Amino acid sequence: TRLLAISPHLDDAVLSFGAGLAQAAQDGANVLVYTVFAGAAQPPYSPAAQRMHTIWGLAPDDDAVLYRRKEDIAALDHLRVAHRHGRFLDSIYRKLPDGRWLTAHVEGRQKLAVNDHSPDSDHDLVGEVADDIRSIIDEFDPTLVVTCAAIGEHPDHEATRDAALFATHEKNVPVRLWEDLPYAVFKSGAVELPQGFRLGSADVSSVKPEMRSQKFQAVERYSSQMVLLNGSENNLFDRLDEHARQNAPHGGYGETTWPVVRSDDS
Numbered sequence: 071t072r073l074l075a076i077s078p079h080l081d082d083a084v085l086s087f088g089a090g091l092a093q094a095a096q097d098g099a100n101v102l103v104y105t106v107f108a109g110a111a112q113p114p115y116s117p118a119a120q121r122m123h124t125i126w127g128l129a130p131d132d133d134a135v136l137y138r139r140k141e142d143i144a145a146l147d148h149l150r151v152a153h154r155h156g157r158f159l160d161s162i163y164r165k166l167p168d169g170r171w172l173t174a175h176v177e178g179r180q181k182l183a184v185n186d187h188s189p190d191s192d193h194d195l196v197g198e199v200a201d202d203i204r205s206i207i208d209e210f211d212p213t214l215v216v217t218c219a220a221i222g223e224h225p226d227h228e229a230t231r232d233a234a235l236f237a238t239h240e241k242n243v244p245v246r247l248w249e250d251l252p253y254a255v256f257k258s259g260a261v262e263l264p265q266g267f268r269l270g271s272a273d274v275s276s277v278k279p280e281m282r283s284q285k286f287q288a289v290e291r292y293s294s295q296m297v298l299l300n301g302s303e304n305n306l307f308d309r310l311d312e313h314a315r316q317n318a319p320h321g322g323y324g325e326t327t328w329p330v331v332r333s334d335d336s
């Protein structure tokens with residue numbers, strides 16, 4: 071078993087699928103977690119990115135990607151799994167064809183806005199990511215790929231998911247999507263996939279207490295994300311536990327995943 075996890079950002083795979091990853095490694099699978107939007111970034115940073123760096127406990131002009139890459143390696147090392155850091159820039163670092171930043175801070179507004187841009191630029195990014203995933207599939211030869219459902223509709227999550235669907239389809243490799251956490255605690259769960267793909271029946275995993283502990287300890291390695299993830303209740307792990315309990319009342323901890331299959335008539 072060769073399991074390739076494809077994470078949009080440096081944290082998503084562990085938050086969403088860390089128990090699954092840790093399980094797979096125990097069961098003797100060869101596990102690699104490739105993060106798409108782990109591309110090196112350097113100043114000048116946008117006001118929005120500088121604001122994010124501050125929220126992450128860094129100075130505005132710190133090399134945030136380096137800090138986050140080191141966190142990811144610690145987290146994945148804790149799960150006893152391999153890492154691979156991709157070349158693509160997080161949405162907060164990307165520019166539009168016209169030279170504007172992709173993402174902007176709006177005075178008063180907490181949530182960051184995305185600037186309008188052409189169909190083509192979106193298409194091009196997904197195409198590039200798909201190219202890199204195809205290359206990694208050739209190199210690593212996975213028997214299973216897992217990536218995000220993009221619950222919560224983060225553009226980087228949607229780009230990752232779509233690129234993985236295209237690449238795995240072309241390469242004829244089985245693929246599953248995980249339930250994005252903690253996003254799924256606040257969103258309906260429904261997603262719109264690219265034409266021709268659909269979700270099969272959910273699997274809700276059941277993992278031993280030791281794996282839950284390992285997952286949660288691994289999440290803690292992402293120091294930069296802790297304040298953001300815990301919120302003003304300081305209750306990330308409680309919310310994750312409650313979410314799992316909802317989906318398995320007579321169970322222990324678990325993670326929801328769906329197989330992705332081809333639609334009828336496609």
Ligand SMILES: [Zn+2]
Pocket residue numbers: 078079082224227
């Ligand atoms: Zn993410």
